[PDB]
Each structure stands twice: as structure tokens, then as C-alpha cells.
Design a protein around this ligand. Structure first.
Ligand SMILES: O=P(O)(O)O[C@@H]1[C@@H](OP(=O)(O)O)[C@H](OP(=O)(O)O)[C@@H](O)[C@H](OP(=O)(O)O)[C@@H]1OP(=O)(O)O
Length: 94
């Protein structure tokens, strides 16, 4: 069951550039998979949300810090979309 999907920009870890990715949030277990919007069917990666912390912080930025301390910086297109994503991620992290 897919709780939420949509696109966000995601910042790279070393080079700080922002790329559009499609995100799919699932809840049992809680994963945020992300995919190249124009490319491969296979996911590029997945974020394990159990125990993560998400915070509002370019604008409409927010950050996820996972249980193993990885930081992901994301940017929504509007403040409303940021608010919705943060709320959905928090709920799924429980
Ligand atoms: O090559 P992998 O998939 O191991 O890692 C890349 C990161 O590369 P490095 O670890 O820094 O070598 C990339 O970061 P930089 O390009 O270095 O800024 C990062 O942009 C990659 O993200 P996508 O999967 O394409 O969404 C991707 O990082 P993610 O693990 O997916 O967030």
C-alpha cells in the first residue's frame, strides 16, 4: 500500500546539486523509495524511515536524518507540499 507519491528535488551528498526524483512512500515496513523520473523502472535507492527524524529547514527545504545517521536534503515545489511530506514521513517513521 502506497501512502504518498510525488516528485521532490534531492541534493547530492558530495556535489550539492539538486535532481528531481519521484518518491514513493510505503508504510509496512516504512520505506521512501525514489526513482529517476525520466529513466529506469528500478529504484535508485530507498530510505529506511523507522526511527528517522525529519525537519523543516532554495526554499521549501526539509531534511531526513535516518537511524544510521544519513542526511537527505529534499526540496518541495510549494510550502504546502513540504508540510504534507513532513507529516506523512513522520507518521510512517513510528
Ligand atoms: O553512486 P551511489 O548510488 O552509491 O551514490 C550516489 C551519490 O554518489 P556518491 O555516494 O556521492 O558517490 C550521489 O551524490 P553526488 O553525485 O556524489 O553529489 C547522489 O546524487 C545519488 O543519488 P540518486 O541515487 O541518483 O538520487 C546517489 O546517492 P544515494 O545513495 O541514492 O542518495
Amino acid at each position: 500500500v502506497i501512502i504518498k507519491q510525488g516528485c521532490l528535488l534531492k541534493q547530492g551528498h558530495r556535489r550539492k546539486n539538486w535532481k528531481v526524483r519521484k518518491f514513493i512512500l510505503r508504510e509496512d515496513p516504512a520505506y521512501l523509495h525514489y526513482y529517476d523520473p525520466a529513466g529506469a523502472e528500478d529504484p535508485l535507492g530507498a530510505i529506511h524511515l523507522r526511527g528517522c527524524v525529519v525537519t523543516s529547514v532554495e526554499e521549501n527545504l526539509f531534511e531526513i536524518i535516518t537511524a544510521d545517521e544519513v542526511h537527505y536534503f529534499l526540496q518541495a515545489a510549494t510550502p504546502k507540499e513540504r508540510t504534507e511530506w513532513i507529516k506523512a514521513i513522520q507518521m510512517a517513521s513510528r
